[PDB]
Design an enzyme around this catalytic site. Structure first.
Site, PDB file in Angstrom:
ATOM      1  N   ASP A  86      -3.254   2.395  -5.991  1.00  0.00           N
ATOM      2  CA  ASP A  86      -2.550   2.476  -4.729  1.00  0.00           C
ATOM      3  C   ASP A  86      -2.156   1.179  -4.026  1.00  0.00           C
ATOM      4  O   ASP A  86      -1.305   1.195  -3.128  1.00  0.00           O
ATOM      5  CB  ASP A  86      -3.458   3.323  -3.815  1.00  0.00           C
ATOM      6  CG  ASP A  86      -2.872   3.574  -2.483  1.00  0.00           C
ATOM      7  OD1 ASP A  86      -1.908   4.350  -2.370  1.00  0.00           O
ATOM      8  OD2 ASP A  86      -3.397   2.994  -1.530  1.00  0.00           O
ATOM      9  N   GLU A  87      -2.776   0.067  -4.418  1.00  0.00           N
ATOM     10  CA  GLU A  87      -2.524  -1.210  -3.762  1.00  0.00           C
ATOM     11  C   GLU A  87      -2.317  -2.407  -4.682  1.00  0.00           C
ATOM     12  O   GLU A  87      -2.893  -2.485  -5.769  1.00  0.00           O
ATOM     13  CB  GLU A  87      -3.689  -1.543  -2.825  1.00  0.00           C
ATOM     14  CG  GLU A  87      -4.374  -0.342  -2.216  1.00  0.00           C
ATOM     15  CD  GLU A  87      -5.480  -0.720  -1.249  1.00  0.00           C
ATOM     16  OE1 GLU A  87      -6.300  -1.606  -1.555  1.00  0.00           O
ATOM     17  OE2 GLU A  87      -5.544  -0.116  -0.169  1.00  0.00           O
ATOM     18  N   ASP A 133       0.843  -1.203   0.000  1.00  0.00           N
ATOM     19  CA  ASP A 133       0.000   0.000   0.000  1.00  0.00           C
ATOM     20  C   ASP A 133       0.885   1.263   0.000  1.00  0.00           C
ATOM     21  O   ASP A 133       1.566   1.534   0.988  1.00  0.00           O
ATOM     22  CB  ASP A 133      -0.888  -0.047   1.242  1.00  0.00           C
ATOM     23  CG  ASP A 133      -1.928   1.050   1.264  1.00  0.00           C
ATOM     24  OD1 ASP A 133      -1.552   2.219   1.099  1.00  0.00           O
ATOM     25  OD2 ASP A 133      -3.117   0.736   1.477  1.00  0.00           O
TER      26      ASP A 133
HETATM   27  N1  LIG Z   1     -12.675   9.189  -1.121  1.00  0.00           N
HETATM   28  C1  LIG Z   1     -11.508   8.929  -1.694  1.00  0.00           C
HETATM   29  C2  LIG Z   1     -10.640   8.020  -1.111  1.00  0.00           C
HETATM   30  C3  LIG Z   1      -9.417   7.753  -1.708  1.00  0.00           C
HETATM   31  N2  LIG Z   1      -9.098   8.424  -2.903  1.00  0.00           N
HETATM   32  C4  LIG Z   1      -7.806   8.149  -3.573  1.00  0.00           C
HETATM   33  C5  LIG Z   1      -7.887   6.808  -4.308  1.00  0.00           C
HETATM   34  S1  LIG Z   1      -6.114   6.379  -4.418  1.00  0.00           S
HETATM   35  C6  LIG Z   1      -5.576   7.676  -3.251  1.00  0.00           C
HETATM   36  C7  LIG Z   1      -4.576   7.155  -2.221  1.00  0.00           C
HETATM   37  O1  LIG Z   1      -4.495   8.067  -1.124  1.00  0.00           O
HETATM   38  P1  LIG Z   1      -3.895   7.563   0.279  1.00  0.00           P
HETATM   39  O2  LIG Z   1      -2.794   6.615   0.015  1.00  0.00           O
HETATM   40  O3  LIG Z   1      -3.590   8.753   1.104  1.00  0.00           O
HETATM   41  O4  LIG Z   1      -5.149   6.810   0.950  1.00  0.00           O
HETATM   42  P2  LIG Z   1      -4.982   5.598   1.999  1.00  0.00           P
HETATM   43  O5  LIG Z   1      -4.257   4.431   1.457  1.00  0.00           O
HETATM   44  O6  LIG Z   1      -4.252   6.184   3.307  1.00  0.00           O
HETATM   45  O7  LIG Z   1      -6.482   5.218   2.441  1.00  0.00           O
HETATM   46  O8  LIG Z   1      -6.788   8.027  -2.566  1.00  0.00           O
HETATM   47  C8  LIG Z   1      -9.998   9.327  -3.450  1.00  0.00           C
HETATM   48  O9  LIG Z   1      -9.711   9.920  -4.484  1.00  0.00           O
HETATM   49  N3  LIG Z   1     -11.179   9.559  -2.839  1.00  0.00           N
HETATM   50 CA   LIG Z   2      -4.965   2.279   0.279  1.00  0.00          CA
HETATM   51 CA   LIG Z   3      -2.202   4.386   0.293  1.00  0.00          CA
END
Ligand SMILES: Nc1ccn([C@@H]2CS[C@H](COP(=O)(O)OP(=O)(O)O)O2)c(=O)n1
Ligand SMILES: [Ca+2]
Ligand SMILES: [Ca+2]
Ligand SMILES: [Ca+2]
Length: 341
Positions: free
Chosen positions: A105-106, A7
């Site tokens: 992202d993953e 991640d």
């Molecule tokens: N409501 C959301 C939630 C997530 N995203 C995008 C999709 S990919 C990007 C990755 O951000 P982070 O790595 O900060 O998120 P986490 O992996 O901590 O949940 O977040 C987004 O655009 N809208």
């Molecule tokens: Ca994630």
């Molecule tokens: Ca992330």
DNA sequence: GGCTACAGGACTC
DNA sequence: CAGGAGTCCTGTAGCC
């Protein structure tokens, strides 16, 4: 099986820092500006420095600014993040043929044939972390366990810039103790219900009568939770193939007048066709987000591929259907294409 | 009864 | 004050 999940930390914000190192140490908020007024829109993500203070994905930009008026607010540049993402995924492909790219992202890696145990797995994780750091200077968090669910949970527990293993024994522990709301796939609604008959944890699904669980949340979900609680959950890490491609835009003002909506709908079609690239869809759905933020859609499937021209006329017909069967005003309009040839 | 299409529900990042 | 993209499941109604 031994699954290693990767991640990328605060990905969008982190990519922005990589490209502009002076952002380092500052709260960075990546936003989706809607165009209605000064700062209308929402937060896509933000880095740890902004998150510590409550700036989270989804909240309005204006609200985030009330909280951190001196933070750095940047417009989302997805095409850039996708390019960096693709490069990183290719690096992971070097560690395993069985890999599942879950999102920008993953990624999930079945490293069963690579390591004999969790010691070696952990080391493999360190190896991946350092490779990604040395090639792209991006930090990531690694989660390792017996299945995808717990590998994901592991990383949720260790981010950012972490790495963690969850052995068979913690799996068992987690099953008893772990908050069932923290289980992937259980949202507020669903959680309310499971923290509505004392099911507060995975283990509780075992004792509750089955038709009971399933009456609240449905058959698939109950089975899923039960299988996890029994520690018998197994889902293969497989190549994800895209099943739909679409685009949706927010209109300057809400409306239900057809000629006023068309331009938006048409631009969404154009951008969608572009993304289709060489895929030919047989189905098209027009998606509307109403004034109350509710979602409505009407679609049609053809016995043959859809040309851009057929897309245009058919979308207008579906949009009309929406308007003629829902007296609400529309706020966002888009299309989604699927069932590729 | 169960498979299909379609429309809504819920969740995820 | 609420953006963008994509996936899976389920209720309903037609059909075999
Ligand atoms: N409501 C959301 C939630 C997530 N995203 C995008 C999709 S990919 C990007 C990755 O951000 P982070 O790595 O900060 O998120 P986490 O992996 O901590 O949940 O977040 C987004 O655009 N809208
Ligand atoms: Ca994630
Ligand atoms: Ca992330
Ligand atoms: Ca949750």
């Amino acid at each position: 099986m031994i699954v290693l999940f990767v991640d990328f930390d605060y990905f969008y914000a982190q990519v922005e820092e990589v490209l502009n190192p002076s952002l380092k140490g500052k709260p960075v908020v990546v936003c989706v500006f809607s165009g209605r007024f000064e700062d209308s829109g929402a937060v896509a993500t933000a880095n740890y420095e902004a998150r510590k203070f409550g700036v989270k994905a989804g909240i309005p930009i204006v609200e985030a600014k009330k909280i951190l008026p001196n933070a750095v607010y940047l417009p989302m540049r997805k095409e850039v993040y996708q390019q960096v993402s693709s490069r990183i995924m290719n690096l992971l492909r070097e560690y395993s043929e069985k890999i599942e790219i879950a999102s920008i992202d993953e990624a999930y890696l079945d490293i069963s044939d690579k390591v004999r145990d969790y010691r070696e797995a952990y080391n493999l994780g360190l190896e991946i972390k350092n490779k990604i750091l040395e090639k792209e200077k991006i930090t990531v968090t690694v989660g390792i366990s017996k299945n995808k669910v717990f590998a994901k949970i592991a990383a949720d527990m260790a981010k950012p810039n972490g790495i963690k293993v969850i052995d068979d024994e913690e799996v068992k522990r987690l099953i008893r103790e772990l908050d069932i709301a923290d289980v992937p796939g259980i949202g507020n609604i669903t959680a309310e219900k499971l923290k509505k008959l004392g099911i507060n944890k995975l283990v509780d699904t075992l004792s509750i009568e089955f038709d009971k669980l399933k009456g609240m949340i449905g058959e698939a979900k109950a089975k899923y939770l039960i299988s996890l609680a029994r520690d018998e959950y197994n889902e293969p890490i497989r190549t994800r193939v895209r099943k739909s491609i679409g685009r949706i835009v927010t209109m300057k003002r809400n409306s239900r007048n057809l000629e006023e909506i068309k331009p938006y709908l048409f631009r969404a079609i154009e951008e969608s066709y572009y993304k289709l690239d060489k895929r030919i869809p047989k189905a098209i759905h027009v998606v509307a987000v109403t004034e109350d933020l509710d979602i409505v859609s009407r679609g049609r499937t053809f016995p043959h591929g859809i040309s851009k021209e057929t897309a245009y006329s058919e979308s207008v017909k579906l949009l009309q259907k929406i308007l003629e069967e829902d007296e609400r005003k529309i706020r966002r309009i888009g299309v989604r294409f699927s069932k590729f040839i």
